[PDB]
């Protein structure tokens, strides 16, 4: 092969591509990093034609030492990934100190990984700890209805989680830990990466009000599906609120019964 | 052939695929079972390479004895069916006691049929009785506007049916028996399968409030079209309600005249 | 060729297909007839393999004597036309008395032309007279926002036209004759065909409240574009009304100035 | 090659095509001109088979002397560009006086460039001056939510810019100069071209109320992305307003902090 025909390159294309068709990634909005194994990239090693470029990390991340990822690039449009994956994606590998990374493949013409890379790498660190290495994906998109709801709902993790759980029956089961909400922060900073990574200790979903959502999961499909579940519920809520609000909904005891049946432990603070 | 090129595999792909593009099937939301004849699958029998796996049924269903179906799998994403039908779909055949089924094809890597299988198989039983074997499809999707309306309209079969009939002229003719509404229930249970199947005795459409819709029909296109008709009307209603409500609509006598002309008998309780 | 590769078969596919992707043609909703010349079909005459079937017309239409059309079929889904044009479309030719027609090609397996055929053929008669044979297309679809607006706006040709003209600057220039609105009527009847055809004497667009729109034009693209213009304006209006209504809009004198510049004569009753 | 396989022809197709799928370009609504270098077209010169046609300019534009562009045609549908680029696009070159242009390629069957050509060429002149020749694209589309907002928001550059900046965090960084709003004007006139070009001295985005948006940028992707950013924010706002308005938003100081971090100078009048 073509590394472009690898599962993980095809995976990034399906997804940046799916996010774009959803309307979640105007322009260069949004970013997607995927943690790989050395075994994933090894069979494609003769596709690495170029001299790896080194970029230091803002802060040391020893958990991620020697770890490869595939990533979307800075300033790159989700829409374009399907047209030219080597232009728009890079395979990088964190060095043995976790002090920086080498770009092994892609990100042609001096492109570099996403400028939300701190939010990404720091959140991977927390998700690996939190899930005992199960989670491998961090996805950020500008999910339209979730964004709209941040102008309108109390920016309160419990109330926001509870509305999303009410807005589609499956939500409690897909994200029983709820949705962490940050205060608005300047994007692309270490501060926002750190705040996001802290919230990723507690939730697989983190909202950036007036901006977008970060989601974590074990696979591209599951991470995309997680965000899509929250955003579908958000879409339902936007319609309901636009119609003047709920007259009936899923009750607290129904939500509790739901969690019991599906063997999850829903965020207690959201069950007033 | 390729069984993947059979009409029924191509049928499941067109439809799980169409439902996904409609935005009705985020993540693994939704499921689709199709009742086949032995004659459908016979010409593709050398495609069955694997040793059939047996799964017992929750409750005996002798009506369905020796009956083949093609089904979407548990945890599977509608979006993915077009990319890998053998991964995401299975052909199963109910055993001669109707006490369980064998998976003949697909659902690779230990996958199993949808966990709403009770709602499906039990509803097939009722629809076969109700339609003298005409109906062959049960489709469940998360139809967005219908979901939204369950938060806002009286969860009353007559009022809900009447609004949907008003929301597009064709509705009364496509679903003269209306739309049965269940109370909210925990999904994936025998209880909800039983409640859905009871309502399928009376209606080709059954709403799961705050969740989605179940529809039944003779073919994939007709079942999809049935749900699409209800959901289009729901979409119109959501817009109308968002604009402050109706100032004029189809009257009771117009609805009655409509039913007469098209030779259907509309749900009388919905014609206040 | 393949007649399936003819301009007019490819034309019907692009359009029934485009209407479906717009969300305007759920199930079998909507229909599309296109008036052809003998010269269009002549080079494909060896594609007519079957014995033409004769169907009498409900009422005589001598204007249409010996005239060929390509048409969508009764009960057929717009969505399916691209998958199987001979199944879903027919080429018919009105007989020399205009008392009935022969199906020359397509509409396989005993299918027949659309059951709105009276609205179609009668409207073609009026549009040919009205445009000195320029108009060749009648398109009916279930345009979602236009439908929604019929529940909410005064069902008054002048007020409805004026709102649509206000809802996108181009509207007055594309449909200066406005949009005729019928009372609700039972579809598929001679009565509704006759009422629609009468309104087509005065407008290129006719609204069926709580149902859909009929549009006429010289080509498939222009007829589709006409409806799309009205429906885009309707979409804008639905958003504006959902937001609490207009605070500013295009004025009467701006509309008048617009008509003057583009050499059209806008419906005077709509210019209060 | 095929000039149809050139980057700039493929560029116009991706974009008129992308705008159409967004729902921004019903019928012939919208237009797209791209400033080329002689070097772009030189390698495809044997594709120029036809005798160039000369069209005089409404007013002299010496800045544009000898300059080639690729352009969408008058009356042409964005949707169709992908089906037949030579029908729907033209390559033109302004003559050495900037008094008129020759059509070198495309615009077959006596077609001519867009009738908003004054808004285009005059705006290119101002954008070249304003950006020291960096900007190369002028795109006009009927962006749906931005149109809707012109009926509802104060048609005030400062307030409108500030709402759009609030409606998605990235907006201030993508268009720190804001969005110039014109009064409604008759389209296709020198007057509206002149007014638009004046506003392009100050903003990369110009709104035509009740009509659409003009955007300028260095590349097709960046110009499309600019409009898409504004329109995504507009979409969010429409949802928020439909839900009864904002309860919280990005503050003035957050916006200021944002501008500082990203090294832009936001429109001060918009920072009340
Ligand atoms: Zn972002
Ligand atoms: Zn090697
Ligand atoms: Zn938290
Ligand atoms: Zn479900
Ligand atoms: Zn065999
Ligand atoms: Zn019932
Ligand atoms: Zn209709
Ligand atoms: Zn012959
Ligand atoms: Zn009239
Ligand atoms: Zn325009
Ligand atoms: Zn040469
Ligand atoms: Zn200005």
Asked if C228 has any chain D CB less than 8 Å from its own CB, the reply is yes
Is residue A34 within 8 Å of A16, Cβ to Cβ? no
Candidate from A225, A249, A254 with C-beta closest to B26: A225
Number of structural domains found in chain C: 1
Is residue C160 within 8 Å of C142, Cβ to Cβ? no
Asked if C2 has any chain D CB less than 8 Å from its own CB, the reply is no
CA dist D167 and D159 (Å) reads 12
Helix, coil or strand: residue B226: helix
Residue D45 labelled as part of a binding site: no
Residues of chain D contacting A187 with CB distance shorter than 8 Å: 169-170
According to DSSP, the β-strands at C100-106 and C89-94 are: antiparallel
Nearest chain B CA: its distance from A43 CA (Å): 23
Under an 8 A CB cutoff, do C248 and D151 touch?
A: yes
Asked if A22 has any chain D CB less than 8 Å from its own CB, the reply is no
Which segments of chain A are extended strands (E)? 31-35, 53-56, 68-72, 89-94, 100-106, 137-141, 179-181, 205-208, 212-217
* Of residues B140, B188, B147, B189, the one with CA closest to residue B30: B140
CA dist C206 and C118 (Å) reads 15
Enclosing domain of residue D39: 1-272
Ligand 8 centroid distance, CA of C48 (Å): 10
> What's CA D67's distance to the chain center, in Å?
18
Helix, coil or strand: residue C104: strand
Report CA-CA distances (Å) from D258 to A132, C131, C203, D173, D252: 36, 58, 53, 8, 10
Helix (H) or strand (E) holding B254: helix B252-261
CA dist D70 and D51 (Å) reads 17
DSSP chain D: --GGGSHHHHHHHHHHHHHHHHT---TT--EEEEEPPHHHHGGGGGG--S--EEEE-SS--GGGTT-EEEEEBTT--HHHHTT-HHHHEEEEEE-TTSSEEEEEEE-TTT--B-TTHHHHHHHHHHHHHHHTT---EEEEE--HHHHHHTTTS-S-HHHHHHHHHHTSTTHHHH-TT-EEEPPP--TTSHHHHHHHHHHHTT-SEEEETTTEEEEEESSHHHHHHHHHHHHHHHHHHHHHHHTT--SS---HHHHHHHHHHTT----GGG--
Is residue D210 within 8 Å of D196, Cβ to Cβ? no
Q: Report the half-sphere exposure of D185 (CA within 13 A, side-chain side).
A: 18
Instruction: Tell me the Ramachandran region of residue A244: left when phi exceeds 0, alpha when psi lies from -120 to 50, beta otherwise.
Output: left
Under an 8 A CB cutoff, do B254 and C189 touch?
A: no
Nearest chain D CA: its distance from C246 CA (Å): 5
According to DSSP, the β-strands at A179-181 and A205-208 are: parallel
* Of residues B142, B163, B157, the one with CA closest to residue B239: B163
* Residue D27: closest C-alpha in chain C: C225
- Vertex B182: Cα angle to B177 and B183 (nearest 5): 155
Helix, coil or strand: residue A6: coil
Helix (H) or strand (E) holding B147: helix B144-149
Asked if A115 has any chain D CB less than 8 Å from its own CB, the reply is no
Under an 8 A CB cutoff, do D241 and C244 touch?
A: yes
Is residue D219 within 8 Å of D246, Cβ to Cβ? no
The residue count for chain B: 272
* Of residues C218, C221, C219, C178, the one with CA closest to residue C201: C178
Question: Which tokens belong to A72?
Answer: 């979307």
CA dist A175 and A250 (Å) reads 16
Candidate from B77, B150, B187 with C-beta closest to A225: B77
Helix (H) or strand (E) holding A21: helix A7-22
Under an 8 A CB cutoff, do A241 and D236 touch?
A: no
Helix (H) or strand (E) holding C53: strand C53-56
* Of residues A180, A183, A197, the one with CA closest to residue A59: A197
Chains linked to D by 3 or more Cβ pairs within 8 Å: A, C
Question: Which residues have CB under 8 Å from B45's CB, separation 6+?
Answer: none
Helix axes D117-131, D190-200, angle to 10 degrees: 20
CA dist C220 and C26 (Å) reads 20
Is residue D226 within 8 Å of D236, Cβ to Cβ? no
Helix, coil or strand: residue A138: strand
> Can you give the CATH number for the domain in which A237 is found?
3.40.225.10
Resolution of the determined structure in angstroms stands at: 1.8
Residue D211 labelled as part of a binding site: yes
Radius of gyration of chain D (CA): 19
Asked if C232 has any chain D CB less than 8 Å from its own CB, the reply is yes
Q: For the sheet containing A205-208, what is the strand order?
A: A53-56, A100-106, A89-94, A68-72, A31-35, A137-141, A212-217, A205-208, A179-181
Ligand nearest to the CA of C160: 9
Question: Which tokens belong to C6?
Answer: 């003819």
Q: Which residues of B participate in catalysis according to the annotation?
A: 116
- Number of C-beta neighbours around residue D247 at 10 A: 13
* Of residues C242, B142, B207, B188, the one with CA closest to residue A167: B142
Q: What are phi and psi of C130, to 5 degrees?
A: -60, -25
Asked if C28 has any chain B CB less than 8 Å from its own CB, the reply is yes
Is residue B27 within 8 Å of A226, Cβ to Cβ? yes
Chains linked to A by 3 or more Cβ pairs within 8 Å: B, D
Q: Report every protein residue that has its C-beta within 5 angstroms of ion ligand 11.
A: D 46
Chains linked to C by 3 or more Cβ pairs within 8 Å: B, D
Choosing among A5, A232, A250, which should be mutated to test the B contact, i.e. which has the most B CBs within 10 A? A232
Ligand nearest to the CA of D173: 1
The residue count for chain A: 272
Q: Which residues of A participate in catalysis according to the annotation?
A: 116
- Number of C-beta neighbours around residue C216 at 10 A: 26
Residue A124 labelled as part of a binding site: no
CA dist A162 and A153 (Å) reads 11
Under an 8 A CB cutoff, do B257 and C186 touch?
A: yes
How many contacts (CB atoms, under 8 Å) link A and D? 88
If you search the block for the tokens 């629609």, which residue do you land on? C196
Is residue B159 within 8 Å of B272, Cβ to Cβ? no
Clarify whether C26 is annotated catalytic. no
- Number of C-beta neighbours around residue A62 at 10 A: 11
Helix (H) or strand (E) holding B90: strand B89-94
CA dist A97 and A100 (Å) reads 8
The technique by which this structure was obtained is X-ray
Ligand 10 centroid distance, CA of A24 (Å): 25
End-to-end CA distance of chain B: 54
CA dist D165 and D176 (Å) reads 9
């Amino acid at each position: 092969q073509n590394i472009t025909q690898s599962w993980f390159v095809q995976g990034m294309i399906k997804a940046t591509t799916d996010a774009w068709l959803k309307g979640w990634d105007e322009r260069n909005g949004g970013n997607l990093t995927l943690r790989l194994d050395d075994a994933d990239i090894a069979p494609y090693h003769d596709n690495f034609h170029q001299q790896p470029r080194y970029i230091p990390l803002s802060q040391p991340m020893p958990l991620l030492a020697n770890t490869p990822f595939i990533v979307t690039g800075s300033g790159k449009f989700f829409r374009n990934v399907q047209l030219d994956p080597a232009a728009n994606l890079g395979i990088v590998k964190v060095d043995s100190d976790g002090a920086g990374y080498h770009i092994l493949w892609g990100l042609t013409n001096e492109a570099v990984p996403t400028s939300e890379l701190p939010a990404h790498f720091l959140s991977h660190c927390e998700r690996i700890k939190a899930t005992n290495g199960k989670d491998r994906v961090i996805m950020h998109c500008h999910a339209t209805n979730l964004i709209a709801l941040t102008y309108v709902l109390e920016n309160d993790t419990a109330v926001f989680t509870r509305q999303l759980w009410e807005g589609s029956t499956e939500c409690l089961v897909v994200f029983p830990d709820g949705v962490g909400i940050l205060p608005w922060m300047v994007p692309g900073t270490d501060a926002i990466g750190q705040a996001t990574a802290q919230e990723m200790q507690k939730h697989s979903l983190v909202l950036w009000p007036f901006h977008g959502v970060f989601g974590s999961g074990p696979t591209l499909d599951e991470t995309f599906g997680l965000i899509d579940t929250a955003e579908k519920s958000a879409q339902v809520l936007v319609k309901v609120y636009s119609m003047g609000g709920m007259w009936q909904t899923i009750s607290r005891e129904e939500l509790i019964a739901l969690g019991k049946r599906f063997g999850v432990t829903p965020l207690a603070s959201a069950l007033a």
